[PDB]
Amino acid sequence: SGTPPQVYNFKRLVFTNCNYNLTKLLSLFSVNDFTCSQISPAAIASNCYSSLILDYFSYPLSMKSDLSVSSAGPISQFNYKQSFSNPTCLILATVPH
Amino acid sequence: NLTTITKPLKYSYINKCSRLLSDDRTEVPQLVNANQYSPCVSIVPSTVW
Amino acid sequence: EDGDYYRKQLSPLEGGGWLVASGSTVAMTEQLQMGFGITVQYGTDTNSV
Amino acid sequence: YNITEDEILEWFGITQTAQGVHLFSSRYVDLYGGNMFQFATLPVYDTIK
Ligand SMILES: *[C@@H]1O[C@H](CO)[C@@H](O[C@@H]2O[C@H](CO)[C@@H](O[C@@H]3O[C@H](CO)[C@@H](O)[C@H](O[C@H]4O[C@H](CO)[C@@H](O)[C@H](O)[C@@H]4O)[C@@H]3O)[C@H](O)[C@H]2NC(C)=O)[C@H](O)[C@H]1NC(C)=O
DSSP: OOOOOBTTSOEEEEEOSSOOOGGGTGGGOEEEEEEOTTSOSGGGTTSOOSEEEEEEEEOOGGGGGGGSTTOOSHIIIIIOOOOSSSOEEEEEEEOOO | OOOSSOOOSSOOOOSOOOEEOSSOSSEEOOOOOTTOOOGGGGTSOSSOO | OTTEEEEEEOOTTTTOSEEEEEEOOOOOOSSOEEEEEEEEESSSSOSOO | OOOOOOSSOOOEEEEEETTEEEEEESSSSOSSSOOOOEEEEEOOSSOOO
16 A cells, blocks of 8 residues: 555564464565575465564665675665564565556 | 693584474474584584684 | 765764765666565564464 | 304394493393393494484
8 A cells, every 4th residue: 555665765564463464465466576585485474473574665676686685785785684683585576467 | 741632723612503494484492412412513513613 | 866965964962974875766667566575583572473 | 243053033132222222132142032131232422313
């Protein structure tokens, strides 16, 4: 809902003690990039976790390689860095037709 | 007044050891037994650098 | 637009001087592509996600 | 290790214990019966699986 912000003004949603289901969320997703830093991509919706913090933003697939922590570009410099000590995931999706 | 025994390069131990399965979201615990060895030693060399 | 210079004044208690930045733009493609950063935690809260 | 040859039934026992690997044979004393007595205790380092 609404305009997704940019990668440096990423919109934070913290989820705790609520039910989430990616199968009802990924069913409307034309996901292009599906990677997960320091954790598996497939079992992200499977296991139970204490907290899930999800920052969503507008991010093209043309700038995809700056998403990683090991990247030295602008995104890992000044825009958004993911957690080293916590499991992390980078998903770039496209709007379905 | 003794030279038959020698000293190691430097002391070393393990500060983190557990198992991860194929799903890679849940951690399987590891515990040492009475003067035993966890399998984390199996990949650690003779001395940690 | 691409590479817009943005500046602000910082108090000497926080460090002082002038804080400057450049905001680049990668233009809209034929369809919107959005990015999700996901971070799960196992000990911060109640295990009910 | 040595043993003699026969056409009489016999048994052999293997087990692991923290002191070592116990090997049991009745060929030493109970040739005509058969029940397991230790002859060997191998100095193993860990427990096999
Ligand atoms: C297979 O071939 C072997 C030959 O290699 C053959 O062995 C023979 O077995 C008989 C039957 O056990 C033996 O006879 C024994 O003689 C001794 C005295 O020398 C006795 O003490 C024995 O008694 C034992 O068994 C009793 C129960 O049956 C016990 O209660 C008792 O306490 C004793 O322990 C027994 O009478 C014979 O000496 C051997 N011969 C040789 C050459 O080894 C065996 O019979 C063949 N068949 C099978 C099925 O193994």
